[PDB]
A paper describes a structure:
Thousands of outer-arm dyneins (OADs) are arrayed in the axoneme to drive a rhythmic ciliary beat. Each OAD is divided into two regions, a head that contains AAA+ rings (rings) for ATP hydrolysis and a tail that holds together the whole complex. The tail is permanently attached to the MTD A-tubule, while the head region of each HC contains a microtubule-binding domain (MTBD), which binds and releases the MTD B-tubule depending on the nucleotide states. We reconstituted the purified OADs onto MTDs to mimic native arrays and determined the structures, by cryo-EM, of free OAD and OAD arrays bound to MTDs (OAD-MTD) in two different microtubule-binding states.
OAD preferentially binds to MTD protofilaments with a pattern resembling the native tracks for its distinct microtubule-binding domains. The OAD unit together with the four binding protofilaments (OAD-PF) was locally refined to resolutions of ~2.8–3.8 Å for most structured regions in MTBS-1 and to resolutions of ~3.8–6 Å in MTBS-2. However, the inter-PF angles (defined as the relative rotation between two adjacent protofilaments) vary substantially among all pairs of MTD protofilaments. To preserve a stable parallel architecture, the OAD stalks need to rotate with respect to the MTBD regions to compensate for the inter-PF angles. This is enabled by the hinges between stalk CC1 and the MTBD helix H1. We compared the inter-PF angles from our OAD-PF reconstruction with that of the native MTD protofilaments B5–B8. The overall patterns strikingly match each other (a drop of inter-PF angle in B6–B7 and an increase in B7–B8), implying a preferred inter-PF pattern for binding the three MTBDs together. The α-MTBD/LC1 complex requires a wider inter-PF space (similar to that between B7 and B8) to properly interact with adjacent tubulins. The additional charge-charge interactions between LC1 and β-CTT may enhance the microtubule-binding affinity of OAD. Our structure also reveals that LC1 contributes to the MTD protofilament recognition via its interaction with adjacent β-CTT.
Author numbering:
A (entry chain g), B (entry chain m), C (entry chain n): 1 to 440
D (entry chain h): 1 to 430
The structure:
Amino acid sequence: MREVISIHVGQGGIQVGNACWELFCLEHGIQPDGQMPSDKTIGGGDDAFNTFFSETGAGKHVPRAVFLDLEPTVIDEVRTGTYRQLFHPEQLISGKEDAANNFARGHYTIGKEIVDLCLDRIRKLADNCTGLQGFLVFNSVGGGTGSGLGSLLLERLSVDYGKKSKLGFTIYPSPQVSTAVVEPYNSILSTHSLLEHTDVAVMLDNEAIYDICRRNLDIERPTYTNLNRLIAQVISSLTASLRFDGALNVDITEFQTNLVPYPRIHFMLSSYAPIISAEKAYHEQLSVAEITNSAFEPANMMAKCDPRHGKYMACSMMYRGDVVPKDVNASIATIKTKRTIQFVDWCPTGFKVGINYQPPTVVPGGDLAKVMRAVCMISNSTAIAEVFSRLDHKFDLMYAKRAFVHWYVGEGMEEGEFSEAREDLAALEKDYEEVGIETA
Amino acid sequence: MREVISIHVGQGGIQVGNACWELFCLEHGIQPDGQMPSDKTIGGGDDAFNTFFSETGAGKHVPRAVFLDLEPTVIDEVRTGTYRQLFHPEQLISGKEDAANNFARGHYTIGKEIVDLCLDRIRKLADNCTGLQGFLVFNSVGGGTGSGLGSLLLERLSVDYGKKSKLGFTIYPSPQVSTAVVEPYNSILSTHSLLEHTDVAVMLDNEAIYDICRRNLDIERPTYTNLNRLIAQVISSLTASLRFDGALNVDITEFQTNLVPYPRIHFMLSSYAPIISAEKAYHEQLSVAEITNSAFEPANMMAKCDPRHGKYMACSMMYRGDVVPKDVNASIATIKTKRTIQFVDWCPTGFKVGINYQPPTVVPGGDLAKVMRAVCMISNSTAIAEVFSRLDHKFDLMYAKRAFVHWYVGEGMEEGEFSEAREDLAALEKDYEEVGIETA
Amino acid sequence: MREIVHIQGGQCGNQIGAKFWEVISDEHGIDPTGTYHGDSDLQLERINVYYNEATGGRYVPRAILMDLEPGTMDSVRAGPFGQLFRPDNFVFGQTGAGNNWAKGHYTEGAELIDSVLDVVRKEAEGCDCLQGFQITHSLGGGTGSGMGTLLISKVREEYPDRIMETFSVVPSPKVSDTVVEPYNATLSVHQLVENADECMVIDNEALYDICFRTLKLTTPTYGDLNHLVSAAMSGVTCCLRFPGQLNSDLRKLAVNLIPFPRLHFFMIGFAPLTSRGSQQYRALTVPELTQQMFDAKNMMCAADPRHGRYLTASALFRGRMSTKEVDEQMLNVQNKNSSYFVEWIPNNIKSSICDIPPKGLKMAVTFVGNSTAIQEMFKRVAEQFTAMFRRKAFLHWYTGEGMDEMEFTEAESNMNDLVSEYQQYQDATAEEEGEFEEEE
Amino acid sequence: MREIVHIQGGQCGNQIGAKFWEVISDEHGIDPTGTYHGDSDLQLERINVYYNEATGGRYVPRAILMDLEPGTMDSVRAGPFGQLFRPDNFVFGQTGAGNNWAKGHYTEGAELIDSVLDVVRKEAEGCDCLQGFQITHSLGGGTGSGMGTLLISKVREEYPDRIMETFSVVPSPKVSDTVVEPYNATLSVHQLVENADECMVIDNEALYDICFRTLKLTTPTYGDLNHLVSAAMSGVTCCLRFPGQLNSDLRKLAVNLIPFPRLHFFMIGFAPLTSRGSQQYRALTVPELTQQMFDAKNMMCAADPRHGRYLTASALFRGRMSTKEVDEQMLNVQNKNSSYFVEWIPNNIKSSICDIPPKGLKMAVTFVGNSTAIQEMFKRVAEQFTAMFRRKAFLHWYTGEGMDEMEFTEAESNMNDLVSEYQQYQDATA
Ligand SMILES: Nc1nc2c(ncn2[C@@H]2O[C@H](COP(=O)(O)OP(=O)(O)OP(=O)(O)O)[C@@H](O)[C@H]2O)c(=O)[nH]1
Ligand SMILES: Nc1nc2c(ncn2[C@@H]2O[C@H](COP(=O)(O)OP(=O)(O)OP(=O)(O)O)[C@@H](O)[C@H]2O)c(=O)[nH]1
Ligand SMILES: Nc1nc2c(ncn2[C@@H]2O[C@H](COP(=O)(O)OP(=O)(O)O)[C@@H](O)[C@H]2O)c(=O)[nH]1
Ligand SMILES: Nc1nc2c(ncn2[C@@H]2O[C@H](COP(=O)(O)OP(=O)(O)O)[C@@H](O)[C@H]2O)c(=O)[nH]1
Ligand SMILES: [Mg+2]
Ligand SMILES: [Mg+2]
């Protein structure tokens, strides 16, 4: 019944997760103990949670989510947190020693010990689930665990569960702002694995979202926690159709058909539009036709790819709140007419629209305005190519010197596995232009 | 529905703006918060504001107005002002460093950064607007920002929006009283740009309006703030037709047809007539026929061009209040008969009359008498030439010496641009005599 | 923002700086311990222009106190408001310049500046937008002239676009408190005229003249001479720190004060200064203050404007005055002084208004006037320098440090060229009759 | 877990350790009798990293205090927090090295190390997951250099995978508090470069310069010099002991600080250090601290990074800072220092955020930088060493302990190769 398993791998995966499960808990009305208070004298929001939470039968609801890390510190922060009693102790899997920003540790040395225990946990969670919709996965491709083990997970899952969709929300390293020096090496080796085993991969570059916080929320000094909250709001809005009733319902299985035209082109961007500081909410009409325009803004994209270079191959607008289908119709129609927004020829009708009546929830201590409308656009754009080429350029500077290879090779990755990966990503950015080429 | 976007560029622009939006807020009944108090138990002044204020849908009205300055000080004053909660934060755009009375800085160096952000704002406002009438623009041509960036805007606006009329209220420097030494240089470089991109340009020389205050309001020591209030009343009286109901309605679009005979001759003057101190309002009849004669008074012109030298190519009388069309008809007929007032041959019927039942509002603290009749006469006059000849003479003294050029050249402007500009203004003052010449 | 880094270089400079940073702390309400005990919120809106907010809400001057004499530190620490300045920002040698440009420019000073730059760079990079610098140094003594010029030369190579403002005490023949002044000052102006945007020449003679005539002080001390300099120093850069009816800034003054790049020496003056007995009688009105500011007596330079002819001027009126009345006065002044204003470049006088007055006053003015009178004060230094340089007197000190006679010649040449140029601005007025010249 | 076994070898090492184990005790709240008196439960959540919980709720440092001189034990007992250390862990000889690498390596020290390894093994086996070691020795003195290198050689043969971190005081030409320093140090680096995963070179000269300039101390003592080294030593391994917005550890730093195995010499530097008088004026902001950490003055090594070009750098920021603001600053630095960053391997600076600040501070930073500047400090030692070895001066001592001239030539040969390799990756353009 609309069940979604959430796999949070690596620090960036877990900490994004925390923020997701705050939002979900507030949305369905689950308290930190895991017990919804039985109010309104009717089960009014009954079966809403069954997407994300499993009723144990005693009144306590447990998140259907495996938090995985090779490092104990991030998962310990969840165990000594407000939501300690919410998450199943076995679901929160720990490792003694971190991958230390080395794919090789995450994919062979350390990863192969833990992955066995994780798959068992996923199977137990999949057995409870009746008509599972898909596997949401959260991994940082800049980091060791999220790259290495996160890739190994997806490979193993794809053999075990087969058809069940795997929507991956990946935190690709922004080109200007990078946290670690060995990030390219990880990213490239991760992408090759990710390029086969995921169905749809939603790219999110930190720097881009940082800029959105400074621009829309008007915060001079944004943190990761502020960022993770915006990421959550997107995920919520995407899975919303399952959880809450709507006019035009979507599903996690639908995107995979409507957004990916060819198998390898599964990379996407995302843009939640009405990101507004309550300070400037006062002065904004926030009609549907504005929210749509604000979605297709080159700035409001959460990955730092300027789609004006590319051509939109397919768009998936996911509206929430006081949204009328007629109003949406005009808004798309005006976008289709615009010049700045350019669509591929072979896609004559590239929009999949998804209207829910449920408005988005305002998290307390949260940098956002309570707003009666919203939209999360997941877009497949030829522009995505740009991010890959930069990570290729930034990678090719290395491996010319054999810059940091001695680490990766020591930990069981043969040197030709780097050469392979680059060759396959080089084959991707070939494909992305080939589809961008007008029909002959 | 009669929407007008106001673009306030440069100190002179913004400060004039502040005074405009006080008046508008009072006229429609918007309080500083931006919430009209719902009184008379009916929406009686409902949709009057939709000219100048967008409803947000929550009971807050925001001004459709972009305030733009390369300097932070003037826009800050608005942000730390009574109307802080009225204007949309984003609509108030600020620069870090001023153009410093240098067209060049505003048109190339500093401008090119900000204009990008400005146009985005104008697009967002024009999306909300359904059947936009025109862009009102407020820029000083003596000052850097208003000359430079204000000219760069209009250019960009002309390509993007196209037909939509661009009425420009420009504070040309009075010849006797000049605030800055480098004004002529700015004005001429500005006028060339302005000469092609604006539809109608209404000229207002401070000194002239200063004299009106000393003559009509009987103030020994007028300020800018006293001046700005008279400018507002004009703007109000021009747009009035849209906002309030009238017998003979006009529109911003109409002036462009009835006042500009030839494309390049779009320079005008303006004269709001019943400017009366409450002290002498006691002793005056203030009949329509008087108000009209008072409009065509050489002195009561707000630009310091004595129209007795020139021939009136087209007039646009805009009456407000206890005004009878029969009473107007006689008033014009007597003006047509007068000798002092002289009309070009090729214009047989020059007058466009506009009658509004709504009387003008008395601003509290305002140097004006509450009056039951009024008129704003925008007049295309051959006399305008005179102002351009004095700004050409005052510039020709310069650029003989290559006086201040180093600055302008240093900031990107090629020297030859100055020569081009003076050559195009000389071509204008050729045209202005050519049309003045009786028909062959 | 528009922040200003201050460097107070050489004994004189440090003592001027000491008084200045007292004067500005009164207007901004900062107390000697760096706490804010001002009554108005207008005092802390733009403070960042001069102070860099330290932790625990202390305010610290963005001053760089440089000297080659360690004694001066004790002097600036002895002063009230001595605890305001940052220890790190204090940079002091050991030996001293010994009134020797060469010691302060080529040898002793040449070792120190490297250390100073590292501070300059540090405080300049902290500013989001740097307006420029205000250097306060004597041309007469070694340290202030030697280092001062060497620093100025350095900062300009690093920060070309940023304004370089200098408040320099030129040596007066009347006082002559050092023998080798002519040498220091001649070698100084060479370096200043190439690397300073706008230099405000101050003279002790004039300052003493203001103290024995304009004011009636029984015992004028260097304290009282510094207090007049500091008053003016505030005036030049107020419309940054406070609102205005018409705003200005350093760059705005430069653009309208410097017609050609080389003529950038000005005569600062302060208009509301009155003898304490003569207060009753004097009426504080815009006309009254306008009379004093254009009295040659008021100027803090030895050369009387009467001999020269103003190329331009600038007034920076303070307090609540009618802009019309100001403009009337500035016009009135230009009609009177028909000879003392250059023929070409009409409307010579610029006028800025700032709303906030100086403490304990209702209105004030600050005057900045580029004349060809300033030439006269430089001729005095030339005549004196020549007379020494005819015989190669005292030349063995400078030559000892490693300076070469060639330098001394080029310095004289470069100062003679300045003197020729300022005289040339009377030959471009000598245009008068196109048929024949006035000399026959 | 991720436990760290500290070895403080040689007088210099024992005195650094003394101060280090005081500094870490304040952070974790442990009192000088081994009792926890801290106010925050965060102080004990990851105490096991450094301390091993003894019986009766006493905390014992996992420190192995080795020296060939028995007089040093008295010194580490004398110190406040001298009762913390385990009397079984203290392993001391009688004679002493006599500032002789050979005596500390091949003879006197060769007899002791077998006793120390038994303690190392014991403390290493107690840990469920050993992160690695943090050896603190001096390359200059005979004990710290002789035994230190010999132990490092041994521990690595038993524990290859486990990180070997070293905080080594290199002899500075300015100070020159021993004559035979060049010999000891040259023979040391030969053993260190083969067997140390990450070496953080410290210099007394630099530490004195931080004490006279950055701080303004009238009388800087070896206590104060040790306090700065200790402050940094905490920073390098904090994200183990406390939570973080972005976590790191010793292996993570190593993976991102060492491009090629032989280039594992780094310059450590602590940012929030200020003169006591200048504190009022200084503003404690991420930009301000980032400006001090990259200042060549702040580094605890003689060689200015200005001469070299950072192959990479790492920052370990402390307290509550917006990660965006940090990231803005690290980017800003790399654009500015276009020359001082290697062309190949872009986004050279790594950043780590730890939520818990150091005691009595709101924000802090620790800096670890692999530059080609570090070669300049090793050239000083080489130039010095050569001059002695040209004549075979003081060589008879080292030869007397049973070291052959062949060893002195291979040590110089191996140190010159290091200097050649840094200069390669400085000059290289890609
Ligand atoms: N949104 C978000 N991204 C984060 C956060 N922390 C880290 N990241 C991302 O993850 C990258 C660093 O990798 P980590 O997530 O620390 O690595 P990991 O997958 O946990 O694996 P190890 O580093 O081996 O422990 C950064 O470059 C970011 O892109 C966070 O709090 N929020
Ligand atoms: N009506 C009116 N005109 C003003 C006002 N302030 C300035 N002006 C006019 O504008 C000229 C000065 O230009 P500014 O507006 O200061 O300059 P700007 O275009 O903002 O550009 P910058 O000076 O570079 O900031 C004067 O000569 C006046 O003609 C004001 O408050 N009201
Ligand atoms: N206005 C003013 N001038 C000063 C002061 N102190 C010194 N001077 C002048 O500065 C000149 C010498 O410069 P000084 O800075 O003392 O020597 P330096 O230290 O070698 O540069 C003398 O001719 C003095 O008239 C002061 O406090 N105020
Ligand atoms: N920073 C620091 N260095 C020291 C200290 N004590 C000794 N050293 C240095 O260590 C070197 C000699 O090493 P030492 O440990 O005394 O001899 P060992 O015991 O034989 O290794 C000298 O060059 C000293 O500069 C100290 O307390 N702090
Ligand atoms: Mg991690
Ligand atoms: Mg301005």
